[PDB]
Design a protein around this ligand. Structure first.
Ligand SMILES: Nc1ncnc2c1ncn2[C@@H]1O[C@H](COP(=O)(O)OP(=O)(O)OP(O)(O)=S)[C@@H](O)[C@H]1O
Lengths: 156, 254, 172, 56, 100, 156
């Protein structure tokens, strides 16, 4: 009957099918840590923005659109510029990976509708209603419930 | 001695097999009168117990940290710094001492010779090292030979940051034999290949066993920490400290 | 625009008709060295034959020597011209066209493209149009990159594998 | 053939003699399978493998 | 841009094109897409880096590319789904399980 | 009758002509290492992409198309730029790496339909059907079989 207690009983006794409509609604709402103020974020190396990106050329896009029997699509100036600066001011600071782990964490967050440095609870539309998940509590057993069982019928 | 090194240090026992058998050759008549016994090149990722082996061999094979002879290669980064190894030549400032390292080996011939980090030195410092791994015919400023027989020359250097082991073990599995064994040797070959890039491959021929250390993760790191608490058991008792660890006590740390 | 296309197709026939006999012939061999008994695309030869023709047009304007008089000077000139002309145009090479023309220059296996069966086509009076892959006899197996590449397996990985040891796995 | 490398100048051929053959001579001397007066006749088995036939 | 660079046929050697096309749009997306909320450059990085694009050319998948269907007829329904062990989402989940 | 056992008998007793249609189909399918997950790759120095490459100029291509009695085809700016940046540090390594073993390995892989850093099993169309080969098991004796004997008749 309370938001926090039901997920402690999901492993023990009761399943997901027997919950109330107001209990499924409450378990998909965010916790009490949401609305609690915490103004701090870290590790501002996100894979969302590309530093190699540039504007639409509008002359190359005209040239690539006419199919022009060409041999290369992109511009390759800024993406060779980032390769050169990685080998010079980086080889002093020697190699870094950033894929052994920071890549796959941020990719899995993008499947849950979570931004990359976002430490809080994030919505994603499952069927007809939203489910607020985070990095910490993925609510994966609810997403299995509201996708499988809620194909034909409606729940709120 | 193979069992006792497996106590304090856990991983990379194949390096220990090459390490312990060099002592086995020294203890018997299987001795090389020219080459110093037990030269090694300890490449590996940053964080593993590479220099820790030189501490354990001083505590076990020589019963004292006095036979451990650290060489802070960060002092020897300059090209002028190479005279600090062998001392100043005659007619110059100093010359009363035969040097920093070369004097200290003369009174303790049975001692390990630790070189800390060969990645940060000028290549002129490596030029003296060609004779050091090659023979015991190292002359002072007064040109007397120094007995580097029975010296185990441990030479750690990282290069961990650069590539191979730098690539983080993608699968932190203990050892997949069809995978880990194959890929590791491909990076180790590259590590050897890199040396030709920098350590001037004459120096590679002087090495008896290049050893790549395997980078730690959750399977390995789970086993290390209990022995660190056993190091707290031996040192901090008598004043009575005897710790214990649990399933959760190690999982909280990792 | 189709009219201008016609005259500049004619200008490779009024002049340059002697090189394109040696050019298309050295291209039929080069497609065989790049691909090597796989299905070649009949449509994007035409994209790459125009770049190969512009390599031979660029070399023959730089040579006072005749093509029939000294032919290998042109193979060093044409292949290096399209070792770089492909490199400045082709970004991705899935068939490794820049990479293979690198090793034809560095290993000098292009001397087989000028041989006694091959010097008969370039002297004969055939228009470039008529030079087909059937007209070009195949090199022997020893002269394909495949054989040479496979010969670099055997050498290196007989010795690359004899790089270092498990040091105690060897029992007796 | 297990350690042929001319680029390294045939020192790894002798390291392979020292780190393999001589190490088995050192390990098998501590444990008493080698008497002080034993003749050693190393021969390859042609079975993927090395064997040393000890002789007295 | 890739098929004008290849003398090899597409049906004769298909994975040469997947290494050619995906790397072409690993960079073509990177020079055009500034913000990736769905991480399009970042995921094509890991499809190249983990080589799980070999499942895009398989025995159910080689039947569509040989067949005579125009590219306008190809819908998401005609392409059969990859197994869950092959996709990037389970690859990224199994990775975070192992590393954490 | 099993995929793994037949290639151990190909050297010993039986040839390639006496296999079943379902055995030739099974021996050309990939092994069990295919479908087994392994997110590890290395040595990202491929000869597939050219860093010296640039866009179609569309004014030079207009000029080179008219046959113009010219003396040079390509642009030569980015390919002299790569020559200059290569000479910056005398190449102690690479004056004779990267011009040797790594080139011929990646060339032989491109004849088998394998990408350059691709450590897994790769298809190539031989006759009417596909044969999955890799770096490790080249399946060269099958390619000799399905090219020579399968000229006129059909096998699956
Ligand atoms: N395999 C191991 N066995 C025992 N202790 C280890 C091991 N790996 C790491 N340690 C411990 O972790 C630390 C390792 O120190 P070291 O890495 O040897 O110093 P270091 O070698 O200079 O490090 P790097 O790699 O050069 S930055 C010490 O506290 C060791 O006790």
């Amino acid at each position: 009957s309370v938001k926090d207690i039901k997920k402690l009983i999901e492993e023990g006794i009761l399943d997901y099918e027997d919950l109330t409509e107001n209990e499924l609604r409450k378990l998909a709402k965010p916790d009490d840590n949401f609305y609690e103020l915490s103004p701090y974020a870290s590790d501002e190396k996100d894979l969302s923005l590309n530093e190699t990106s540039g504007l639409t050329n509008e002359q190359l896009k005209n040239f690539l659109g006419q199919n022009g029997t060409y041999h290369m699509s992109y511009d390759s100036k800024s993406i060779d510029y980032a390769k050169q600066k990685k080998s010079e001011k980086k080889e002093d600071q020697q190699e870094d990976d950033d894929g052994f782990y920071d890549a796959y964490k941020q990719i899995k967050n993008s499947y849950d509708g979570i931004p990359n440095n976002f430490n809080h609870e994030a919505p994603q539309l499952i069927g007809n209603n939203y489910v607020f998940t985070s990095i910490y509590d993925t609510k994966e057993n609810l997403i299995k419930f509201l996708k499988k069982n809620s194909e034909y019928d409606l729940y709120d | 001695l193979y069992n006792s090194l497996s106590k304090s240090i856990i991983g990379n026992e194949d390096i220990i097999k090459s390490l312990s058998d060099a002592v086995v050759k020294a203890a018997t008549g299987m001795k090389d009168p020219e080459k110093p016994i037990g030269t090694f090149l300890f490449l590996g990722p940053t964080g593993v117990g590479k220099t820790e082996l030189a501490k354990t061999l001083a505590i076990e094979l020589f019963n004292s940290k006095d036979n451990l002879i650290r060489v802070n290669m960060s002092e020897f980064t300059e090209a002028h710094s190479v005279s600090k190894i062998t001392g100043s030549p005659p007619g110059y400032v100093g010359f009363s001492d035969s040097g920093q390292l070369t004097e200290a080996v003369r009174e303790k011939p049975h001692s390990v010779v630790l070189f800390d980090e060969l990645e940060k030195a000028h290549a002129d410092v490596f030029k003296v090292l060609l004779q050091i791994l090659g023979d015991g015919y190292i002359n002072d400023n007064h040109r007397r030979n120094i007995d580097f027989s029975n010296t185990i020359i441990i030479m750690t250097s990282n290069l961990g940051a650069e590539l191979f082991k730098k690539k983080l073990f993608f699968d932190a599995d203990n050892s997949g034999t069809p995978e880990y064994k194959r890929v590791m040797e491909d990076v180790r070959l590259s590590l050897i290949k890199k040396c030709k890039k920098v350590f001037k491959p004459e120096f590679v021929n002087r090495i008896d066993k290049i050893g790549v250390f395997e980078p730690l993760n959750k399977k390995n790191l789970h086993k290390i920490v209990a022995l660190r608490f056993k190091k707290l058991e031996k040192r901090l008792e008598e004043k009575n400290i005897q710790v214990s660890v649990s399933e959760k006590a190690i999982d909280y740390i990792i | 625009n189709p009219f201008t296309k016609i005259i500049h197709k004619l200008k490779k026939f009024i002049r340059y008709r002697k090189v394109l006999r040696w050019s298309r012939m050295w291209w039929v061999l080069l497609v065989r060295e790049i691909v090597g008994d796989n299905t070649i695309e009949k449509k994007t030869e035409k994209a790459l034959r125009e770049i190969w023709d512009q390599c031979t047009i660029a070399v023959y304007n730089n040579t006072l020597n005749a093509v029939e008089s000294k032919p290998l000077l042109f193979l060093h000139g044409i292949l290096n011209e399209c070792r770089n002309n492909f490199a400045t145009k082709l970004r991705q090479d899935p068939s490794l066209i820049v990479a293979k023309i690198d090793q034809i220059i560095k290993s000098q296996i292009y001397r087989f493209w000028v041989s006694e069966p091959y010097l008969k086509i370039g002297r004969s009076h055939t228009l470039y149009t008529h030079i087909t892959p059937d007209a070009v006899p195949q090199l022997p197996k020893e002269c394909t990159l495949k054989h040479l590449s496979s010969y670099m397996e055997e050498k290196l990985k007989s010795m690359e594998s004899k790089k270092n040891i498990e040091s105690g796995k060897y029992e007796f | 053939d297990q350690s042929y490398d001319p680029e390294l100048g045939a020192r790894p051929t002798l390291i392979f003699i020292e780190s393999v053959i001589m190490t088995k001579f050192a390990i098998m001397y501590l444990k008493k399978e080698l008497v002080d007066d034993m003749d050693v006749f190393v021969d390859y088995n042609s079975k993927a493998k090395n064997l040393v036939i000890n002789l007295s």
